[PDB]
């Protein structure tokens, strides 16, 4: 699976992966679980959406987008 | 269960027909319905569920529940035929004796 | 437009099976149930049976032993099987569509086939 | 009011006798597909969460005196999109009290399909982790969805379901809420067959009404 | 033969409605303590693993007609050490074949304590870790075992259990086997109540024999 | 050295109640069930309570027969309603093992309940 | 839930007593138990058709043909009774006034 | 609660390890990452000892976590010419990260 990443940060998948895409942001720190669920301790400014294959990030190394639909769970640029 | 209806009625160009039940009070759970019969056995559905009117029926037809008997009221009757009321009894419709409406 | 037509033998001797197929048209047979209403001569209607849209058939209880309603969705033809016929069973037979989802009442009635039983 | 002795059929796809049961977790569906909504009116419907296939059904009276089949619940349609695809033949709602102000509702529906249809659904399952010592662990739901196809056969029985968490109770509840993540789900009679598909020929007799 | 209709009571010690169901995994106990064996004779006996509380029992015949409670199964006891502590009123064995070589066998024993007793046993709970993607994930049994006290009440109906993964060909089963730490377990009718304690007053139906 | 003994009225009138207490000794009621048998002037299985506290009555006699036992007090009671004229006999309470013997071993002397 | 028949009487100076049943199943389930009688003392002699009560001497049960039987290989004069567990209870036979 | 690293740590098999402490839930599939962007290596359940290596990193990495106390042991073999470092042992949320054992 190939995920392309290009404020609103986008990480589009190469194939449908449902909603299995955690966002990862020193040791990288996670932001979202399942691409829409905010994680404990993160500021509420972060937001993550998308459900089928096109996942977007909006905030109001960078921010990797680890999809966990198939081994090996891949990462974005 | 037995559904009993008046044998005859008369009017001129409103009437009320009572669909009495032999078990207990008529409720929305019985899903009353009225089917008018014209000459030559031409049947049609004029009221369903005690509130719902079948497609194409004139707006003058109206039904409701009064007391323990379900009734259908005709406003501004112009309709002379035999009127049958059928009440759902949780497994099978039961059919009342014809009203024998006159105009 | 919605239509319902009925075809019956028109005359059957006692103890001879009754076969009538009310071939509905204009409405799908998998959404609206089909009842069987028989109007004896000079009498009020009597319920016979129904075949629901999911195929569960409910008979009039008195006539459950003999009556048997089946249906063929592809050809939209409901069938009625009456065994052990009797003289008093003569009556005009109707097939009636029931909209048990929106209207809840018997909307359209068939023309009717006059089944006469005699010698 | 009847008793329904359900005889469980073979596992439906994508389930199987040797893998965790899959249930349509969220209330939405993938693009070009719809969820199986058991709808009375537009303001009252219970989406499908856990789908099951019933090979045969044996109805009874409340005292278990043999009885015939019931007429379909009138006014109830298992609409997928706008068009109906099945008739509902029973209903039952398990109201469990997780806490004094936390209630878990698990509606059930035994519906017979009039028109074969196939849909794709976001599926998930119930996972219980491991805890050291005697610490409590919650029978959670995996928050990771996985699109899959569910096939329903014409004229075949099915035991749909729905589960919800309601905080603060109405005096039948028409509340449809997703299967949450990080929320414990105490097991109840209407949820026991959603931890792993039961074998074929397994009977599970239920107390199912025939009206709201 | 009958068709029992159990009515599960409130969870037994140390289980609770908001916690996982503990099961006696190994076949031994700490010093000075014994397991709850269900012994037909000295050679044949199943080690009780799961325990549950039954409030009341209703017996219906095969065609589901009224009947009276049966006589206790003669020859079957529930031995703690060398002393009898209950009578077995109904037995059942849900045989499930995982594959040709591996078969699961869940045996449900319905007993009625004659004298109350309490023993300390090594406990554990069924668990199933989360999985990535859609891979099948097994319903194992934890490895660590938590020593905990178990209590039985005189005159109270109880439903025990014993699961043995009988490898190889086999014809009934008296093969007593531990709950293995890493063997995948299949869910059958005899394990539905061994995930979380069911709510009180829930009627789970079964079909139980009265002999071997 | 396991004994038994029943106290019986010894005389009753029809439609009355029969109160017979079958005491035990030399063992416990938590292991063996007590059977209730009668010997009208063969032997009739009246009823039995088992060690675990459930019981079983002759089908034809389930309305009138009631069996109650007192574990610690080592006592067993039989109460008969709608007593008829034909219920005259010596009533026996037998300890049944249903653990290793599956039978009847020790019987109480019996008490002539005459009607 | 059937009937059970047993020999009316027997005479001797080895003897066997047979307990037949209307069903005739003669299953091990019957758990036949031959409790004896004395001038009105009833005692336990056999249980399960092959066991024995404590202290009982010569006595030995067996399943001969389709009718459960007893074996006695002057002090044994008794009206021996045969009991056969039906599914829920015991059904005594007439007994043998040996 | 926290994953700690046992030291920074050719052709010599060098385990790269990470030990999590204050943990209440055992079985949560500890991952394993190498960052010269991130590149998955494999995952091992702390319980059951089951691993699913990314095939690009098979025959070169062998992960085995201890049983009595959880601790990841990535038994790297035949090391070649960069650093391989952090591991993620998930939880309901927020407990799974450790300092990478940067290898040179
Ligand atoms: C290193 O890895 C091996 C497996 O290849 C394992 O047996 C060993 O315990 C690990 N480290 C230690 C502490 O020796």
DSSP string across H40-54 = E---B-TTTT-B---
Give the contacts of D145 (CB within 8 A, at least 6 positions apart). Answer: A18, A19, A20, A34, D25, D26, D122, D123, D124
DSSP E62: T
| Structure-block tokens of residue C59 | 């008979």
Produce one character per residue of E166-195: b if its CB has 16 or more CB atoms within 10 Å, e if not: beeeeeebbebbbbeeebbbbbbbbbbbbb
Backbone angles phi, psi at E190, to 5 degrees: -85, 5
DSSP F31: T
**To 10 degrees, the CA torsion angle through D185, D186, D188, D193?**
60
Are C68 and C81 spatial neighbours (Cβ–Cβ below 8 Å)?
yes
| Structure-block tokens of residue E191 | 């394990």
Are E141 and E6 spatial neighbours (Cβ–Cβ below 8 Å)?
no
Alpha carbon distance E121, E23 (integer Å)? 9
DSSP D192: G
H47 lines ligand 1 (CB under 6 A): no
DSSP string, A18-39: TT-EEEE-----EEEETTTEE-
Alpha carbon distance B72, B88 (integer Å)? 16
H64 CA closest ligand 1 atom index: 4
| Structure-block tokens of residue A65 | 């987008």
Produce one character per residue of F19-44: b if its CB has 16 or more CB atoms within 10 Å, e if not: ebbbbbeeeebbbbbbbbbbbeeebb
Give the distance (Å) from ligand 1 centre to CA of residue E143. 21
Give the distance (Å) from ligand 1 centre to CA of residue H73. 6
Give the distance (Å) from ligand 1 centre to CA of residue B34. 85
Phi/psi region, residue D210 (left: phi>0; alpha: psi -120 to 50; beta: rest), is alpha
Backbone angles phi, psi at D188, to 5 degrees: -140, 175
Residue A28: list chain H partners with CB under 8 A.
Answer: 38, 86, 97
Cis omega (within 30 of 0) on the bond before C97? no
Alpha carbon distance C69, C60 (integer Å)? 11
Alpha carbon distance B2, E47 (integer Å)? 63
For residue E103, which of E21, E26, E34, E188 has the smallest C-alpha distance?
A: E188
Handedness of CA D171, D174, D180, D185 (dihedral sign): positive
Alpha carbon distance F49, F68 (integer Å)? 7
Alpha carbon distance E111, E80 (integer Å)? 14
Alpha carbon distance D116, D120 (integer Å)? 14
Task: Kindly list the partner chains of chain G, i.e. chains with 3 or more CB atom pairs below 8 Å.
Answer: E, F
Could you give the 3-state DSSP secondary structure of residue G4? strand
Handedness of CA E135, E139, E143, E144 (dihedral sign): positive
Are E137 and E129 spatial neighbours (Cβ–Cβ below 8 Å)?
yes
Are E3 and E61 spatial neighbours (Cβ–Cβ below 8 Å)?
yes
Distance from CA of A27 to the nearest CA of D (A): 24
CA angle G39–G42–G45, rounded 5-degree value: 120
Alpha carbon distance F51, E119 (integer Å)? 21
Are D15 and D200 spatial neighbours (Cβ–Cβ below 8 Å)?
no
H54 lines ligand 1 (CB under 6 A): no
| Structure-block tokens of residue A22 | 């955690």
Find where tokens 């969220």 sit. D26
- Asked if B33 is an interface residue toward chain C (Cβ–Cβ < 8 A), one would say yes
For residue D69, which of C64, B28, E3, C36 has the smallest C-alpha distance?
A: C64
Q: Which of 36-55 (F) contact G at CB < 8 A?
A: 37, 39, 42-43, 45, 48
Residue of A nearest to H57 (CA): A72
Could you give the 3-state DSSP secondary structure of residue F61? helix
Find where tokens 């048990």 sit. C100
DSSP D104: E
Could you give the 3-state DSSP secondary structure of residue E120? strand
- Asked if A10 is an interface residue toward chain E (Cβ–Cβ < 8 A), one would say no
DSSP string, D122-157: EEE-EEB--BSTT-----EE-S--EEEEEEE-TT-E
Whether B90 and D71 lie within 8 Å, measured CB to CB: yes
Chains A and F touch (3+ CB pairs under 8 A): no
Whether G89 and F45 lie within 8 Å, measured CB to CB: yes
Alpha carbon distance D127, D138 (integer Å)? 9
Handedness of CA E170, E172, E176, E178 (dihedral sign): positive
* CATH architecture classification, F3-109: Sandwich (2.60)
DSSP string, D19-72: B---EE-SS---TT---BEEEEETTEEEE--S--EEEEEEEE-TT--B--PPPP
Alpha carbon distance C74, G22 (integer Å)? 59
- Asked if F102 is an interface residue toward chain G (Cβ–Cβ < 8 A), one would say yes
Domain assignment of residue A51, yes or no: yes
For residue E188, which of E210, E206, E170 has the smallest C-alpha distance?
A: E206
Give the contacts of G55 (CB within 8 A, at least 6 positions apart). Answer: none
Whether D144 and A34 lie within 8 Å, measured CB to CB: yes
- Helix segments in chain G, DSSP class H: none
| Structure-block tokens of residue F112 | 């002539």
Find where tokens 């999809």 sit. A67
Distance from CA of E159 to the nearest CA of F (A): 15
In B12-103, at which residue ranges do the beta strands (DSSP E only) sit? 15-21, 33-38, 42-48, 61-66, 69-74, 82-88, 93-95
H75 lines ligand 1 (CB under 6 A): yes
From residue E147, alpha-carbon distances to E13, E24, H47 in Å are 12, 9, 20
Determination method here? cryo-EM
Find the length of chain H: 104
B86 beta partners: B33, B95
Task: Kindly list the partner chains of chain F, i.e. chains with 3 or more CB atom pairs below 8 Å.
Answer: E, G
Are E199 and E211 spatial neighbours (Cβ–Cβ below 8 Å)?
no
Residue G85: list chain E partners with CB under 8 A.
Answer: 74
Find where tokens 């002795």 sit. D5
Alpha carbon distance D40, D36 (integer Å)? 13
| Protein residue closest via CA to atom 10 of ligand 1 | H73
Alpha carbon distance D56, E158 (integer Å)? 31
Backbone angles phi, psi at B29, to 5 degrees: -70, -10
Task: Kindly list the partner chains of chain B, i.e. chains with 3 or more CB atom pairs below 8 Å.
Answer: C, D
Find the length of chain D: 212
Residue H28: list chain D partners with CB under 8 A.
Answer: 129
Residue D181: list chain A partners with CB under 8 A.
Answer: 33-34, 37
Residue D117: list chain C partners with CB under 8 A.
Answer: none
Produce one character per residue of D40-67: b if its CB has 16 or more CB atoms within 10 Å, e if not: beeeebbbbbbbbbbeebebeeeebeee
Radius of gyration of chain B (CA): 13
Residue of D nearest to H46 (CA): D130
How many pairs of residues across B and C have Cβ atoms under 8 Å apart? 67
Give the distance (Å) from ligand 1 centre to CA of residue C102. 70
Whether D77 and C56 lie within 8 Å, measured CB to CB: no
Are F59 and F77 spatial neighbours (Cβ–Cβ below 8 Å)?
no
| Protein residue closest via CA to atom 7 of ligand 1 | H64
From residue E165, alpha-carbon distances to C76, D131, E36, E128 in Å are 53, 25, 20, 18
H9 lines ligand 1 (CB under 6 A): no
CA C61 to chain centre: 15
Residue E86: list chain F partners with CB under 8 A.
Answer: 52
H60 lines ligand 1 (CB under 6 A): no
- A 10 A CB-CB count for A7 gives 6
Find the length of chain B: 103
Residue A70: list chain E partners with CB under 8 A.
Answer: 133
Are B19 and B32 spatial neighbours (Cβ–Cβ below 8 Å)?
yes
Long-range contacts of D32-36 (CB under 8 A, 24+ apart): D32/D120, D33/D119, D33/D120, D33/D121, D34/D80, D34/D81, D34/D119, D35/D80, D35/D119, D35/D121, D36/D78, D36/D80, D36/D85, D36/D119, D36/D152, D36/D160
In chain F, at which residue ranges do the beta strands (DSSP E only) sit? 3-7, 18-25, 33-39, 44-49, 55-57, 65-70, 75-80, 89-96, 104-107, 111-113
Whether F102 and E115 lie within 8 Å, measured CB to CB: no
Domain count for chain B: 1
Distance from CA of E151 to the nearest CA of H (A): 28
A63: domain range?
4-67
Q: Which of D69, D74, D115 minimises the CB distance to C30?
A: D115
Distance from CA of D128 to the nearest CA of H (A): 10
Give the distance (Å) from ligand 1 centre to CA of residue H72. 9
Give the distance (Å) from ligand 1 centre to CA of residue H18. 12
DSSP F56: E
Alpha carbon distance D203, B13 (integer Å)? 64
CA contacts within 13 A on the Cβ side of D99: 9
Q: Classify burial at E59, counting beta carbons within 10 Å of its beta carbon; exposed 0-12, middle 13-18, buried 19 or more.
A: middle
Q: Domain C18-114 adopts which CATH fold?
A: Immunoglobulin-like (2.60.40)
DSSP string, C26-72: SS-TTTSEEEEEEE-TTS--EEEEEE-TTS-EEE-STTTTT-EEEEE
Mutate to test the interface with E, among G28, G32, G48, G88 (most CBs of E within 10 A): G88
Give the distance (Å) from ligand 1 centre to CA of residue H6. 13
**To 10 degrees, the CA torsion angle through F71, F75, F80, F86?**
130
DSSP G30: G
**To 10 degrees, the CA torsion angle through D188, D192, D194, D200?**
-150
- Helix segments in E95-155, DSSP class H: none
Distance from CA of E3 to the nearest CA of D (A): 11
Are D89 and D73 spatial neighbours (Cβ–Cβ below 8 Å)?
yes
Chains C and B touch (3+ CB pairs under 8 A): yes
Give the distance (Å) from ligand 1 centre to CA of residue H65. 9
Domain count for chain E: 1
| Structure-block tokens of residue E179 | 């709950």
Find where tokens 């199933």 sit. E128
Alpha carbon distance G26, B55 (integer Å)? 74
Residue E62: list chain G partners with CB under 8 A.
Answer: none
Alpha carbon distance D89, C30 (integer Å)? 15
G69: domain range?
1-98
For residue D84, which of D98, D74, D92 has the smallest C-alpha distance?
A: D74
| Structure-block tokens of residue D32 | 């070009």
- CATH homologous superfamily for the domain H1-97: Immunoglobulins (2.60.40.10)
| Protein residue closest via CA to atom 3 of ligand 1 | H75
Whether D143 and A68 lie within 8 Å, measured CB to CB: no
Give the contacts of B58 (CB within 8 A, at least 6 positions apart). Answer: none
| Structure-block tokens of residue D11 | 């596992």
The domain limits of chain F are 3-109
The CATH number covering residue G58 comes to 2.60.40.10
Give the contacts of D63 (CB within 8 A, at least 6 positions apart). Answer: none
Chains A and B touch (3+ CB pairs under 8 A): no
Whether E74 and G88 lie within 8 Å, measured CB to CB: no
Give the distance (Å) from ligand 1 centre to CA of residue H15. 7
Alpha carbon distance C69, C50 (integer Å)? 7
For residue D165, which of D67, D120, D99 has the smallest C-alpha distance?
A: D99
CA H82 to chain centre: 16
């Amino acid at each position: 699976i190939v995920l392309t990443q290009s404020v609103s940060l986008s990480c589009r998948a190469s194939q449908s992966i449902s909603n299995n895409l955690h966002w990862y942001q020193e040791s990288p720190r996670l932001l979202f679980k399942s691409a829409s669920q905010s994680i404990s301790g993160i500021p509420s400014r972060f937001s993550g959406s998308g459900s089928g294959t096109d996942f977007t990030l909006s905030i109001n190394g960078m921010y990797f987008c680890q999809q966990t639909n198939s081994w090996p769970l891949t990462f974005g640029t | 269960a037995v559904v009993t209806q008046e044998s005859a009625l008369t009017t001129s160009p409103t009437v009320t027909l009572t669909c009495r039940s032999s078990t207990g009070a008529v409720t929305t759970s019985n899903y009353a319905s009225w089917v008018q019969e014209k000459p030559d056995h031409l049947f049609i559905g004029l009221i369903g569920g005690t509130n719902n009117r079948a497609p194409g029926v004139p707006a003058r037809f109206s039904g409701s529940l009064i007391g323990d008997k379900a009734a259908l009221t005709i406003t501004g009757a112009q309709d002379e035929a035999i009127y049958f009321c059928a009440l759902w009894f949780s497994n099978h419709w039961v059919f009342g004796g014809g009203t024998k409406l006159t105009v | 437009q919605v239509q319902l037509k009925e075809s019956g033998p028109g005359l059957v001797a006692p103890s001879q099976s009754l076969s009538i197929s009310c071939t509905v048209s204009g409405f799908s047979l998998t959404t609206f149930g089909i009842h069987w209403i028989r109007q004896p001569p000079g009498k009020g209607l009597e319920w016979l049976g129904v075949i629901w849209a999911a195929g569960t058939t409910n008979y009039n209880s008195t006539l459950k032993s003999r009556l048997t309603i089946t249906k063929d969705n592809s050809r939209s033809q409901v069938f009625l099987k009456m065994n052990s016929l009797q003289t008093y069973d003569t009556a005009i037979y109707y097939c009636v569509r029931e909209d048990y989802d929106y209207f809840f009442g018997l909307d359209y009635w068939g023309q009717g086939t006059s089944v006469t039983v005699s010698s | 009011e009847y008793k329904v002795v359900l005889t469980f059929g073979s596992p439906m796809s994508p389930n199987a006798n040797n893998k965790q049961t899959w249930v349509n977790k969220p209330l939405d569906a993938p693009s070009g597909h719809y969820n199986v909504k058991i709808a009375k009116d537009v303001d009252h419907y219970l989406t499908m969460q856990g789908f099951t296939s019933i090979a045969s059904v044996d109805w009874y009276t409340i005292d278990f005196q043999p009885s015939e089949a019931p007429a379909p619940i009138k006014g109830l349609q298992v609409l997928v999109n706008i068009s109906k695809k099945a008739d509902v033949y029973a209903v039952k709602q398990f109201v469990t009290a997780q806490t004094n102000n936390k209630h878990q509702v698990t509606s059930l529906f035994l519906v017979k399909v009039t028109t074969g249809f196939q849909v794709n659904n976001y599926l998930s399952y119930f996972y219980r982790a491991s805890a050291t010592g005697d610490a409590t662990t919650n029978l959670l739901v995996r928050g990771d969805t996985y699109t899959a196809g569910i096939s329903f056969t014409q004229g075949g029985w099915y035991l749909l379901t729905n589960t919800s968490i309601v905080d603060g109770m109405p005096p039948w509840v028409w509340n449809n809420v997703e299967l949450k993540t990080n929320t414990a789900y105490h097991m109840d009679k209407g949820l026991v067959h959603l931890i792993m598909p039961l074998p074929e020929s397994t009977q599970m007799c239920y107390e199912m009404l025939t009206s709201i």
